Design a protein around this ligand. Structure first.
Ligand SMILES: Nc1ncnc2c1ncn2[C@@H]1O[C@H](COP(=O)(O)OP(=O)(O)OP(=O)(O)O)[C@@H](O)[C@H]1O
Ligand SMILES: Nc1ncnc2c1ncn2[C@@H]1O[C@H](COP(=O)(O)OP(=O)(O)OP(=O)(O)O)[C@@H](O)[C@H]1O
Ligand SMILES: [Mg+2]
Ligand SMILES: [Mg+2]
Lengths: 1030, 103
């Protein structure tokens, strides 16, 4: 619903008011305290989640008018009161009570209240001081309640809801740090004077581009539609009066050259943008490079000074999409539309931006204009995505002169005339976003503090620019390459281009209209390449040529060569060399920026004449933080989606948790994970919508399913490379390994974490070797490692390496072991090394292949100089005497850790409870009783056998109970039934938990026996007593 | 070491069932009697005269193998089923051989 708005003098805790008329259109005598909902119009991508408000009925309010407290939002009634909003009546007033709320309070009043020992005295103080009353009051997660004093610190999990101390814990927090001195809500403070604040004859303030779009329906005044269009300006404070001419006035002042008239407005009261500023759309700032302090004065004029300029001679800027047949038609048609649909003043030495959707493309539309009425389309469907600049160029003025700023084109008295092209340089992104204003496809914002390769390339382009702005032409060029796929090669070049205000061509080679086709048309392809490039350079500003996937066309010699294969190869190398070097003289300062996928595959000649080299890696954890910070941002979710209900994160999200758990993933995977989370949350939202329900105002992402999606991301990685997946084994699914978990965390966690303070010494502990009797978890530890940590889990299953032919090692072990270097940080798991690496001194006949494996394995493994790429090799053995001197304590695999028969007293209990994870037992038979009833010398996995066959007899009990119950059924109803119909017509839920009460334990203790006897233990205890030779 | 691995403790666990036979419990892996392994070790007894009864009560019916003509469909000794309890010492060794002799 539309509603009119007004701000009351504010009690903050005082209710809003509901008008009698809305209390008739949605009148309900059972609910006179009608809880309203309001949407607050604002600057921003969309209206932030609306507020539930507690209200009192008022009959005095005019039609659809509503009043809310001012200072409840930190604004004061001295500021311009917004006259409208939107309202929603809450269906049946259905609202949940909050599960938890926390408050922050200053240490003085905190202690003054905590001095009261009787908690109810503080509860009454909530009433006496704050006039809070339960069930009446609704509270909101973070709202400051009084400057310097009380604040709500959180509501959880809901952002809003009812309160009652009968369920709401009312947590309090002490502001020891006095930040409440800074955390004051008051958006305005009274200035010491309005005079002497500059002089009304001349003010100087930094201009800024408005960080968002703004539209004719939000502004307070009422411009016309056909004229007054497009050009507007926005001001922040009593500055609106320091100009002597109020909001709604024109001003025209500029720092240099011609004047530029603009309509100036006060900002809407609900604004987040920093004051002491004059905000503008990109349209204005585009004409005024740097010089951010702008001259300002009253500068008023009596309406439009010039009513006609009888012809205009506009020109397009050069630039990538501005010079293609497939865009030409859409360009001219959108130009015609734009200029036809409204009347505007224009001036020489000025730019006009035009925006359109490049998807419209090869759709012509046959009848919408020129033979049809002026208002023609809903751009809701005829979208926008790409932007162009037209220079206004010359215009035919009348006898009047010099005041060119008012030129205007009557749609019948005047025409627009093409002059082919002009040259001008775009704004520097550092001062102003275009993209975030138009909402286009985004270009992620790096910062040179933490991306070394960006600092590199940006410095290269910066010098290539400025050195040739000075007298020294630079032929700078660079190639980007990477070890992995999918690192953001193009993104870097684009970002740099915007960050430096540098033009670019964007070209991809894959889309060339022919392959490396056998019949020679390398001429045709390289010709099309140059012919497409050259067209803009005659009017290019300083610019770069970016070539995507050079590897597709710079093939390289020798696999099996046709004569034509040689001719194509050499022809391509030659013509590319010529093309590039020629460009370096055809135009100065114009930089070739290539990209490639396998640096081994680029041909040697090109590899020599190329200049700089940059290797861009898979990002660090420190970088991951900023990656999530981007794609989880408000704008970066809100763009994609139609429905007016917005989305957000919960402020609980642990960026540490994501950055650690997402280790090794590439940026493109981080997008995948976040967008999957968005999907799952929306599915939850529509599941909620099945009932009248709660939380309808907005779905948020939450830490649980955002965590979960990592597992899918890792499996979809694994199916690309390294197909094996692993069943989950969470940390608590093992126990009774305390020393071993100690050392494993001392090896894989603490040296891996905290390199800000761990020196990351020049060598590292390579691995872990588990040895001992079978059935002591030494397999399970590996599946646990694969489950809980972010590490990937490559492995070979024992003698998976050996193979039929001679020369076994390159057929497997080399390819896999180097693949682990090729992968991101990942373990290699081994089992049965006593089978894979026989002690070389036990020489073998019949080709001695054990010597071949063992030699290659040591050579690929050890030494590890310049090679500490996290390649932890971890594994298990039965009997370590058969291990080679591969185990000799160089630290190449020699982190020996034993596992064995547990301590008698309670570690068997820790075993039983761990294996009882997600098991069920629900009586007075505490696990202490089981752990005492079991005799000793049973060990490890044999207790899993004891649970296994206890479970088997428990399900047997249930199966025979079912057999009885189904027999007694069939005797009385369903005389001809057996299975599917039976199970589909029973509906058990008390029985279906099928909990064992007891007795299955006792008959397990009768039926089970230790799987290795002491006479078997002695054979292991011997090697145990070798201590591997100590 | 390959066979002691591939089926167990990795992808490969899933739903496969395994059913062995041996001449001896000696010449077989110590990796018996683990839940991750071959484990149940079902008993096969020495077949007594009662198992002679059982075996003959099977031999008397090539059950529904071509229902239109049983193997030994037409016989004397409809009285004195279990016609060969005398074979109690035979250990049940390959009585299809004696059945072929009878044929
Ligand atoms: N750091 C990043 N920030 C934002 N988006 C990124 C980032 N890295 C990658 N992307 C996204 O992934 C894509 C990067 O495309 P780009 O051309 O750079 O590489 P690619 O196509 O994955 O790889 P290649 O050219 O090697 O085949 C874009 O969709 C971009 O949005
Ligand atoms: N906390 C635990 N401590 C010990 N054993 C456990 C624990 N949790 C589960 N187990 C059992 O231990 C088994 C793994 O034992 P282990 O890896 O030592 O033997 P194995 O895989 O049969 O043999 P091998 O080590 O020779 O490959 C699991 O399958 C499970 O039944
Ligand atoms: Mg790419
Ligand atoms: Mg094991």
């Amino acid at each position: 619903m539309k509603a009119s708005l007004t701000f009351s003098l504010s009690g903050i805790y005082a209710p809003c008011s509901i008008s009698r008329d809305i209390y008739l259109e949605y009148g309900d005598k059972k609910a006179e305290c009608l809880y309203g909902t309001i949407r607050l119009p604002q600057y921003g991508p969309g209206c932030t989640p609306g507020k539930i408000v507690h209200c009192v009925l008022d009959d005095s309010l005019p039609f659809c008018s509503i009043v809310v407290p001012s200072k409840l939002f930190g604004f004061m009634p001295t500021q311009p009161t917004m006259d409208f909003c939107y309202f929603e009546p809450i269906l049946d007033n259905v609202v949940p009570v909050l599960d938890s709320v926390t408050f922050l309070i200053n240490e003085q009043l905190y202690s003054k209240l905590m001095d009261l020992p009787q908690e109810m005295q503080q509860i009454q103080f909530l009433h006496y001081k704050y006039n809070i009353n339960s069930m009446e009051t609704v509270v909101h997660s973070r709202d400051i309640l009084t400057s310097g004093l009380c604040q709500i610190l959180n509501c959880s999990p809901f952002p809003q809801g009812l309160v009652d101390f009968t369920e709401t814990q009312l947590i309090l927090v002490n502001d020891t740090e006095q930040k409440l001195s800074a955390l004051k809500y008051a958006n305005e403070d009274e200035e010491y004077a309005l005079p002497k604040i500059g002089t009304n004859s001349a003010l100087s303030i930094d201009l800024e581009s408005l960080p968002c779009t703004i539209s004719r329906d939000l502004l307070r005044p009422a411009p016309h539609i056909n004229d007054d269009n497009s050009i507007y300006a926005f001001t922040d404070a009593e500055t609106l009066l320091r100009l002597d001419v109020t909001s709604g006035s024109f001003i025209t002042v500029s720092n240099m050259g011609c004047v530029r008239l603009v309509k100036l407005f006060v900002l809407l009261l609900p604004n987040g943008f920093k004051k002491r500023t004059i905000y503008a759309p990109p349209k204005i700032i585009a004409s005024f490079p740097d010089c951010s302090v702008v001259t300002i004065s009253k500068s008023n004029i009596g309406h439009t000074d010039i009513p006609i300029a009888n012809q205009v001679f506009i020109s397009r800027v050069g630039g990538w999409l501005q010079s293609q047949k497939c865009f030409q038609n859409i360009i001219l048609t959108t130009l015609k539309k734009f200029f036809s649909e409204s009347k505007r003043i224009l001036c020489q030495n000025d730019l006009i931006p035009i925006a359109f959707d490049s998807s419209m493309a090869d759709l012509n539309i046959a009848e919408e204009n020129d033979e049809s009425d002026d208002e023609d389309e809903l751009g809701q469907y005829y979208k926008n995505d790409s932007l162009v600049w037209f220079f206004v160029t010359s215009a035919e003025l009348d006898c009047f002169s010099k005041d060119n700023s008012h030129f205007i084109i009557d749609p019948n008295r005047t025409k627009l005339i093409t002059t082919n092209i002009t040259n001008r340089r775009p704004l520097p992104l550092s001062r102003s976003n275009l993209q975030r204003y138009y909402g286009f496809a985004e270009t992620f914002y790096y910062d040179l503090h933490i991306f070394p390769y960006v600092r590199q390339l940006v410095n290269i382009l910066e010098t290539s620019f400025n050195c040739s702005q000075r007298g020294i032409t630079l032929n700078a060029s660079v190639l980007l390459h990477s070890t992995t796929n999918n690192v953001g090669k193009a993104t870097m070049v684009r970002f740099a281009s915007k960050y430096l205000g540098i033009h670019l061509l964007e070209i991809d080679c894959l889309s060339l209209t022919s392959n490396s086709r056998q019949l020679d048309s390398t001429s045709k392809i390289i010709g099309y390449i140059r012919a497409k490039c050259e067209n803009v350079l005659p009017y290019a500003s300083p610019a770069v040529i970016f070539l995507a996937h050079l590897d597709s066309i710079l093939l390289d010699v020798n696999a099996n060569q046709d004569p034509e294969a040689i001719k194509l190869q050499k022809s391509i190398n030659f013509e590319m060399s010529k093309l590039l070097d020629d460009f370096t003289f055809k135009f100065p300062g114009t930089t070739f920026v290539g990209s490639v996928n396998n640096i081994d595959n680029v041909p040697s000649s090109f590899r020599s004449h190329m200049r700089f080299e940059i290797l861009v890696p898979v990002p660090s954890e420190a970088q991951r933080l900023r990656i999530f910070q981007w794609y989880l941002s408000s704008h970066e979710l809100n763009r994609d989606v139609q429905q007016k209900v917005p989305v957000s994160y919960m402020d609980n999200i642990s960026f540490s948790s994501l950055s650690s758990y997402s280790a090794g993933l590439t940026p493109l995977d981080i997008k995948s994970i976040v967008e999957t989370a968005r999907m799952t949350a929306t599915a939850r939202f529509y599941q909620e919508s099945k009932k009248c329900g709660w939380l309808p105002q907005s779905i948020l992402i939450t830490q649980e399913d955002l965590s979960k999606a990592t597992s899918k991301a890792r499996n979809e990685f694994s199916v690309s490379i390294g197909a094996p997946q692993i069943p989950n084994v969470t940390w608590d699914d093992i126990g009774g390994i305390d020393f071993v978990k100690g050392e494993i965390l001392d090896t894989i966690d603490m040296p891996l974490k905290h390199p800000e303070l761990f020196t990351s010494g020049m060598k590292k502990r390579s691995g872990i070797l588990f040895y001992g009797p079978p059935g002591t978890g030494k397999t399970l530890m590996a599946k646990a490692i694969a489950t809980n940590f972010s590490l990937n889990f490559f492995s070979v299953k024992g003698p998976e390496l050996l193979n039929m032919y001679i020369g076994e090692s390159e057929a497997n072990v080399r390819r896999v072991f180097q693949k682990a270097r090729e992968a991101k940080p990942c373990v290699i798991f081994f089992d049965q090394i006593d089978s894979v690496a026989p002690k070389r001194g036990n020489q073998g006949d019949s080709g001695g292949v054990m010597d071949r494996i063992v030699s290659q394995l040591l050579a690929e493994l050890d030494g590890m100089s310049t090679d500490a790429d996290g390649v932890f090799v971890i594994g298990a053995t039965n009997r370590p005497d058969l291990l080679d001197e591969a185990l000799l304590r160089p630290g190449r695999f020699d982190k020996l850790l034993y596992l064995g028969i547990p301590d008698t007293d309670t570690k068997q209990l820790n075993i039983l409870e761990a294996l009882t994870r997600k098991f069920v037992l629900d009586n007075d038979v505490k696990l202490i009783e089981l752990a005492k009833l079991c005799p000793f010398n049973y060990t490890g996995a044999d207790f899993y056998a004891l649970c296994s066959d206890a479970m088997l007899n428990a399900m047997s009990r249930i199966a025979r109970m079912v057999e009885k119950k189904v027999s007694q059924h069939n005797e009385l109803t369903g005389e001809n039934i057996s299975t599917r119909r039976w199970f589909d017509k029973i509906a058990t839920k008390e029985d279906t938990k099928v909990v064992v009460k007891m007795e299955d334990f006792l008959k397990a203790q009768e039926q089970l026996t230790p799987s290795v006897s002491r006479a078997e233990l002695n054979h292991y205890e011997a090697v145990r007593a070798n201590f591997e030779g100590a | 070491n390959q066979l002691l691995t591939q089926m167990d403790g990795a992808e490969g666990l899933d739903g496969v069932y395994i059913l062995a036979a041996t001449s001896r419990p000696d010449l077989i892996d110590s990796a018996l009697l683990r839940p991750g392994r071959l484990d149940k070790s079902v008993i096969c007894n020495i077949p007594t005269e009662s198992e002679r009864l059982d075996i003959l009560q099977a031999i008397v019916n090539s059950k529904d193998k071509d229902t239109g003509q049983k193997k030994f469909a037409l016989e004397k000794n409809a009285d004195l089923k279990l016609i060969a309890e005398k074979t109690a010492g035979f250990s049940g060794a390959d009585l299809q051989g004696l059945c072929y002799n009878a044929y």
